Design a binder for this molecule. Structure first.
Ligand SMILES: CCCCCCCC/C=C\CCCCCCCC(=O)O[C@H](COC(=O)CCCCCCCCCCCCCCC)COP(=O)([O-])OCC[N+](C)(C)C
Ligand SMILES: CC(C)CCC[C@@H](C)[C@H]1CC[C@H]2[C@@H]3CC=C4C[C@@H](OC(=O)CCC(=O)O)CC[C@]4(C)[C@H]3CC[C@]12C
Ligand SMILES: CC(C)CCC[C@@H](C)[C@H]1CC[C@H]2[C@@H]3CC=C4C[C@@H](OC(=O)CCC(=O)O)CC[C@]4(C)[C@H]3CC[C@]12C
Ligand SMILES: CC(C)CCC[C@@H](C)[C@H]1CC[C@H]2[C@@H]3CC=C4C[C@@H](OC(=O)CCC(=O)O)CC[C@]4(C)[C@H]3CC[C@]12C
Ligand SMILES: CC(C)CCC[C@@H](C)[C@H]1CC[C@H]2[C@@H]3CC=C4C[C@@H](OC(=O)CCC(=O)O)CC[C@]4(C)[C@H]3CC[C@]12C
Ligand SMILES: CC(C)CCC[C@@H](C)[C@H]1CC[C@H]2[C@@H]3CC=C4C[C@@H](OC(=O)CCC(=O)O)CC[C@]4(C)[C@H]3CC[C@]12C
Ligand SMILES: CC(C)CCC[C@@H](C)[C@H]1CC[C@H]2[C@@H]3CC=C4C[C@@H](OC(=O)CCC(=O)O)CC[C@]4(C)[C@H]3CC[C@]12C
Ligand SMILES: CC(C)CCC[C@@H](C)[C@H]1CC[C@H]2[C@@H]3CC=C4C[C@@H](OC(=O)CCC(=O)O)CC[C@]4(C)[C@H]3CC[C@]12C
Length: 688
């Protein structure tokens, strides 16, 4: 009976996934052999293939021995506070999946193995899962009880973490306010004079307005390319005593024969005239920029306390005839400066700001972000999961190129190869959208990346293929429907099949071994780096590429993938106990790989605490989803009104409600996952 739908949302098993114990004994061995293969490969590719694994700084395995020798203090001196707090998050989850580890394997698994309901059946893996319990047993009360305890340990884990965190930001930031919405013709003097009149112990050290710096930074970078060329070809020619030539058009290497070619243009003359031209237009822009004030300012005060009391004075809220609202105070200049409109906030760190993107404000930023997210959301609505893509392909017969050869290896392999393809592609199409919204700050870009990327992964990886729905259209269709309340059991009975548990254990094994080896190899990065290197039109530009290619570490993506595997592991934790040790093994190997990547591979970022403290929210999201997975199980077997179905519902109603109060204000303390202890603001090139 449960066949024509429960295996609809993933393409189906190869060689039954291996005969014994749901394939786990087979898949674990093969993925482990791929681990040994890909790390042997990385040991060569790291050291040989144009330094790509080594840029942001040895015997054959001194890479590996370095992972085990690195100190936390030495991460701090190399990578700054964001790396330390990121590694502190992981270390709490490695502990949480050891208490959950020992309680799931120690007590939930032997209680399952006791049961009758799947005893005779062939599927030996299935016995370890909740489906093996008889319905009329208080043993379901123990499963309800642990699903509750795992919420409290997850809350206690993050209350511990957050109290240790004690994030540090430089004193220049603590005294600087970002004032947004000021009059466009507010010269520095009047911004200074407003506060230095209006507040008692006031003194303003700086008041720096913003300007439309976009093209001025473009020209600075181009000018730098010109200089790097001129200097290198000079230094080369002084030693070689022979000149060099480059084609002025793009992709100059491809000019292999003279047909409108003109490859013979001399390097020194080229870089000279180029540098002079760029210097000339750079001046023209710099003089023009002062006629484009963006109508914002950063103001830096002498005193941290007065910064606070201004910031409060503009955020106060009290009664007037229309509404409760704020009332910022009068002065000599309050009208000319339009103090009616000011939004006041602590400024980001000046390396956290995108001085380009400050240009894009008001109606147009929202119109542009809306367009990107509406077009994206429609695409994710109808193509949410790889299975609906492959199924729609088959319904339009586009498998046709395979049957040119029609080899029996290829026709059976090709579907799995395309699932790998779309599974890697669809979260990437989400992740890259954040790079076109033009967030004003690297915090904003990374927060947006976490919440979008994670949310999509929870539907692509966990929810949709669990209930056996291929797409968000199909999910809302089933939810709105006509008779949901009278038939939802047919989809809940689909979540707790042995086959479905076995699939999720296998997802985590592939994620532990192959997944992490790919995070070490970074082959898309390597491929883009080699193609960019090869297309560079000159020797000077090749060296330029090698220095530039090391990025800042993508904390938002790194969290989004991490809490996703945690969410799979801790939803399937009570219902399918065997999954948790592979969840732990994923976290050890991820933690070793990230210590390498942060220190050796990536450059340091600098991001506001909003990201690190934001990722704490999704750690609470994991055990919340696990109580749903028992409200489903309990409600379809015992009924809704039976005790285990009410208990794990009233708990959940309290948990949803207290979260949505937190969404109005993070002012709760005792019932809260967060426990806490109490010249540079000029655009990078406008100065030059
Ligand atoms: C289907 C059922 C489940 C729910 C699915 C959806 C759930 C998704 C859940 C949450 C989505 C939002 C994440 C939380 C806010 C991130 C913080 C942040 O930096 O935002 C800020 C607002 O910018 C945005 O609003 C960014 C996000 C807009 C796109 C939303 C797409 C929805 C799909 C950007 O910060 P900034 O760069 O400093 O600029 C702010 C000020 N200007 C410049 C913009 C004026
Ligand atoms: C369901 C029944 C079987 C009860 C299960 C009880 C557990 C949930 C308790 C028992 C002992 C507890 C642990 C006792 C000690 C610690 C060390 C503590 O970490 C420390 O390093 C403490 C000292 C320090 O902060 O320096 C963190 C909590 C933890 C893991 C506790 C977590 C909760 C545990 C596992
Ligand atoms: C977080 C970490 C520290 C926990 C480590 C726990 C392991 C010691 C546990 C996890 C899963 C357990 C295994 C789960 C399943 C089985 C199969 C079981 O045999 C059967 O299911 C077949 C019985 C039959 O049909 O004849 C024998 C024990 C064994 C290997 C268990 C042995 C102990 C294991 C490896
Ligand atoms: C790291 C620590 C916390 C692990 C400790 C966990 C053990 C208490 C559990 C883990 C796996 C369990 C085993 C999983 C499955 C089986 C098979 C099953 O064998 C039978 O006696 C029934 C065989 C049959 O009649 O078919 C029940 C006992 C046993 C060995 C279980 C005994 C208890 C074990 C060893
Ligand atoms: C941190 C907190 C939440 C941990 C403490 C959890 C307890 C309140 C749970 C865990 C195990 C549960 C017990 C597991 C087994 C049973 C046997 C059960 O009786 C049967 O199953 C009878 C079977 C038969 O005779 O056929 C009665 C409830 C009871 C005592 C349960 C009552 C609630 C217990 C003690
Ligand atoms: C590093 C930390 C996280 C602990 C990692 C523990 C693994 C090494 C354990 C966890 C589950 C174990 C497996 C659980 C079940 C089985 C099936 C079992 O199969 C049979 O005996 C065949 C017949 C059958 O039971 O169906 C043999 C052991 C094996 C592969 C176990 C091998 C050792 C595994 C992979
Ligand atoms: C049908 C049952 C299984 C419920 C399914 C609901 C899902 C759609 C929920 C479960 C967890 C939710 C996520 C849990 C936590 C967050 C973080 C949240 O962002 C914040 O933490 C808000 C504050 C901030 O960071 O600025 C944004 C929504 C999101 C992604 C939620 C989006 C909706 C999710 C995926
Ligand atoms: C059945 C499934 C598909 C769930 C359907 C309901 C969702 C459409 C709702 C449930 C909870 C909602 C979320 C609850 C809390 C937040 C945090 C909120 O974050 C903010 O930036 C404002 C709060 C703050 O950070 O101060 C933005 C809206 C969001 C993501 C909400 C977006 C819409 C969500 C995911």
């Amino acid at each position: 009976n449960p066949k024509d739908y429960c295996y609809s949302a993933r393409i189906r098993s190869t060689v039954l996934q291996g005969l014994p114990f749901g394939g786990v004994p087979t898949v674990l061995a093969l993925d482990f052999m791929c681990f040994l293969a890909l790390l042997f490969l990385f040991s060569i590719l790291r050291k040989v293939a144009w330094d790509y694994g080594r840029l942001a700084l040895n015997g054959f395995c001194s890479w590996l021995t370095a992972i085990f020798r690195i100190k936390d203090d030495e991460i701090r001196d190399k990578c700054g506070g964001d790396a330390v707090h990121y590694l502190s998050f992981q270390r709490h989850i490695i502990g949480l999946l050891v208490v959950v580890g020992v309680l799931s394997v120690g007590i939930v698994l032997p209680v399952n193995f006791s049961g009758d309901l799947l005893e005779n059946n062939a599927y030996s893996f299935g016995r370890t899962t909740i489906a093996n319990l008889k319905s009329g047993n208080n043993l379901l009360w123990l499963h309800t009880s642990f699903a509750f305890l795992y919420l409290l340990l997850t809350v206690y884990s993050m209350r511990r973490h957050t109290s240790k965190m004690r994030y540090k930001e430089d004193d220049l930031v603590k005294r600087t306010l970002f004032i947004n919405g000021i009059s466009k013709y507010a010269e520095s003097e009047k911004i200074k004079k407003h506060f230095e009149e209006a507040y008692p112990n006031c003194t303003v050290l700086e008041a720096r307005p913003c300007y439309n710096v976009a093209r001025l930074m473009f020209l600075d970078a181009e000018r730098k390319k010109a200089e790097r060329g001129k200097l290198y070809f000079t230094n080369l020619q002084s030693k070689e005593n022979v000149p060099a030539m480059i084609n002025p058009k793009p992709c100059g290497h491809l000019c292999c024969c003279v047909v409108r070619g003109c490859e013979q243009v001399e390097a020194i003359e080229y870089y000279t005239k180029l540098e002079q031209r760029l210097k000339e237009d750079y001046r023209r822009e710099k003089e023009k920029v002062n006629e484009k004030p963006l109508g914002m300012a950063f103001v830096t005060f002498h005193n941290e306390t007065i910064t606070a009391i201004i910031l409060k004075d503009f955020n106060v809220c009290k009664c007037q005839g229309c509404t409760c609202r704020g009332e910022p105070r009068a002065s000599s200049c309050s009208e000319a400066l339009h103090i009616s409109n000011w939004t006041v906030t602590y400024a980001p760190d000046p390396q956290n700001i995108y001085w380009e993107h400050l240009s894009i404000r008001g109606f147009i930023w929202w119109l542009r972000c809306l367009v990107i997210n509406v077009v994206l959301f429609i695409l994710l609505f109808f193509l949410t999961t790889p299975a609906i893509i492959i199924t729609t392909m088959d319904k339009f017969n586009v498998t046709k190129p395979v049957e040119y050869l029609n080899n029996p290896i290829i026709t059976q392999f090709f579907p799995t190869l395309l699932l790998w393809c779309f599974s890697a592609l669809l979260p990437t199409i989400v992740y890259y959208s954040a790079f076109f919204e033009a967030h004003w700050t690297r915090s904003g870009e990374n927060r947006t990346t976490m919440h979008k990327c994670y949310t999509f992964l929870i539907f692509m990886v966990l929810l949709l293929p669990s209930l056996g729905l291929s797409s968000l259209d199909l999910f809302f269709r089933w939810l709105f429907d006509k008779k949901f309340l009278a038939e939802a059991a047919i989809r809940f009975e689909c979540v707790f099949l042995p086959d479905n548990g076995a699939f999720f254990v296998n997802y985590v094994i592939a994620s532990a071994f192959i997944g992490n080896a790919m995070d070490l190899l970074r082959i898309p990065g390597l491929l883009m780096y080699m193609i960019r290197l090869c297309l560079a039109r000159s020797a000077a530009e090749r060296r330029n590429v090698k220095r530039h290619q090391a990025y800042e570490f993508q904390f938002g993506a790194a969290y989004a993938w991490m809490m996703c595997v945690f969410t799979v592991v801790m939803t399937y934790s009570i219902t399918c106990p065997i999954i948790v040790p592979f969840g732990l093994m994923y976290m050890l190997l991820k933690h070793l790989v990230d210590r390498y990547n942060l220190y050796y591979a990536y450059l340091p970022a600098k991001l506001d605490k909003k990201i690190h403290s934001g990722a704490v929210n999704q750690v609470v999201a994991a055990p919340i989803l696990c109580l749903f997975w028992l409200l489903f199980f309990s409600t379809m077997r015992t009924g809704f009104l039976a005790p285990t179905s009410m208990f794990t519902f009233v708990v959940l109603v309290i948990t949803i409600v207290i979260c949505l109060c937190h969404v109005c204000f993070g002012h709760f303390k005792y019932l809260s996952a967060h426990n806490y202890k109490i010249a540079k603001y000029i655009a990078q090139v406008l100065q030059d």
